[PDB]
Paper text:
[name]-2 (apoptosis-linked gene 2) is a 22-kDa protein of 191 amino acid residues containing five serially repetitive EF-hand-type helix-loop-helix Ca2+-binding motifs (EF1 to EF5) and it belongs to the penta-EF-hand (PEF) family, including the calpain small subunit, sorcin, grancalcin and peflin in mammals. [name]-2 (a gene product of PDCD6) belongs to the penta-EF-hand (PEF) protein family and Ca2+-dependently interacts with various intracellular proteins including mammalian Alix, an adaptor protein in the ESCRT system. X-ray crystal structures of various PEF proteins including [name]-2 have common features: the presence of eight α-helices and dimer formation via paired EF5s that are positioned in anti-parallel orientation. Binding of Ca2+ (or [name]+) to EF3 enables the side chain of R125, present in the loop connecting EF3 and EF4, to move enough to make a primary hydrophobic pocket (Pocket 1) accessible to the critical PPYP motif found in Alix.
Residue numbers in the entry:
A (entry chain A), B (entry chain A): 25 to 191
Write the structure that this text describes.
Amino acid sequence: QSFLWNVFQRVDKDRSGVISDTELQQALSNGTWTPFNPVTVRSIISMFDRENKAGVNFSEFTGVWKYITDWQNVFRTYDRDNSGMIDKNELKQALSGAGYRLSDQFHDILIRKFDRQGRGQIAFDDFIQGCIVLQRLTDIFRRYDTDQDGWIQVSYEQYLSMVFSIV
Amino acid sequence: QSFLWNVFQRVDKDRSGVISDTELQQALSNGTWTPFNPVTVRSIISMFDRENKAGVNFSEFTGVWKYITDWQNVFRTYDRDNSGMIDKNELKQALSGAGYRLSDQFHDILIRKFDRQGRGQIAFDDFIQGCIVLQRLTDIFRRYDTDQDGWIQVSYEQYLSMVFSIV
Ligand SMILES: [Zn+2]
Ligand SMILES: [Zn+2]
Ligand SMILES: [Zn+2]
Ligand SMILES: [Zn+2]
Ligand SMILES: [Zn+2]
Ligand SMILES: [Zn+2]
């Protein structure tokens, strides 16, 4: 699509043909007038950078745009008060949606862990990072939960291996 | 001691009265002609920074110097070929020293995880970071190993809590 090319051209400010980490950061809003989470940008870029330039070309940027737009849909679906910030109540709705069974008190930990703003509400950039991290911890857990009952038994050495495979 | 003050003055290059992250990095050698591990410096400084300036004053720097010198002793004690780099064989000696019972194959993972050089040998700056991380993972594990048999049983929610308490 040619519309994607206009976005690419606007984001690719040095006109190198490759959008770097700083450039994608500048083209993204988190609705709080602070710079979009550098770690989130780092995650998104390395997720679509097939070569290793620390950036994306147009061919890969189409995947990046797909990815970011998908998150905007999901964020807004679970943004019911339309506050532009997912609250404790809504974060539960989001996770409960995807089949997570977690105690109310544990959502306090998730919010304190991902919210770079103090407000106890999660912005779009932090929300993406949060879910990416959560997905990875679930995938790892499932390797060790061989009977699918939400419990694992691990030795000290198996535990270290588990923690190190997070990267 | 006045000798510590001469070191402080030489390290504190902007003469601010506080040694920052960049300044401590420059005053430290890892014996490989690459910059001392920024994460290691970050760990050491935040370990002795009682206030929050992202640096250390003379009162705290004495603790920093104590800490770094302690690591130099330990590093050299386990540096038997005097290579200036702890090898797989020596890393086992180091860990076995402090009572760790880990398989030979798992030391491959530790080395691949901490060695920023490719050589499969751990430099001084990476060695400090490695052990700090290992100590923290052991402390956390011990909270969940209530009967002290080197095994833990945890639910998915307990697992997430465990991972998040690493920080
Ligand atoms: Zn560019
Ligand atoms: Zn909302
Ligand atoms: Zn089971
Ligand atoms: Zn200074
Ligand atoms: Zn050696
Ligand atoms: Zn037991």
